């Protein structure tokens, strides 16, 4: 219904965006390391729904 | 804020015609319901008519056959044609966009009809 603004920090940069997003009611980042490195953590975003 | 954009009114004599049009825009969650409102100084808000996303024309029985219904689905916007005007029908119209949450509601174009 309104604009919404949303900043997130994966491993290697920042996202800043400004849309309509249709956020759910617990907007987490599930988080998993690789089986061989560990070096860098993968993210999967589940903020918003579209 | 979903804004509606109602226009095309005005003055016309008696058997004219007349197209107002409605543009929906901002959120308008796609399974959207747009209708139109009549009320004469004096009276409530009359159904004028309904259409749905299934394409579907609903019409009251005040104006049989004289006002149609036409969608846009590349601007989901609405246009009504009005025509074979009676005086009957001065009226103020207005949207009804039923959305799927917060219903919204115009702001008005007045429909006159006399000789």
């Known amino acids: 219904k309104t604009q919404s603004l949303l900043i997130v920090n994966n491993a290697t940069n920042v996202v800043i965006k400004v849309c309509e997003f249709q956020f759910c009611n617990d907007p987490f980042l599930g988080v998993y390391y690789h089986k061989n490195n560990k070096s860098w953590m993968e993210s999967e975003f589940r903020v918003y729904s579209s | 804020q979903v804004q509606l954009q109602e226009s095309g009114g005005g003055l016309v004599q008696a058997g004219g015609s007349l197209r107002l049009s409605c543009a929906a825009s901002?959120?308008?969650?796609?399974?959207?319901?747009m209708g139109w409102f009549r009320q004469a100084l004096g009276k409530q808000r009359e159904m004028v008519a309904v259409?749905?996303?299934?394409?579907?024309?609903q019409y009251a029985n005040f104006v049989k056959g004289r006002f149609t219904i036409t969608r846009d689905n590349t601007k989901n916007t609405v246009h009504l044609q009005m025509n074979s005007l009676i005086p009957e029908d001065t009226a103020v119209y207005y949207c009804?966009?039923?959305?799927?949450?917060?219903?919204?509601w115009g702001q008005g174009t007045q429909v006159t009809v006399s000789s």
């Open positions: 259409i749905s996303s299934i394409a579907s024309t």
């Open positions: 901002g959120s308008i969650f796609s399974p959207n319901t």
């Open positions: 009804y966009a039923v959305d799927k949450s917060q219903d919204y």
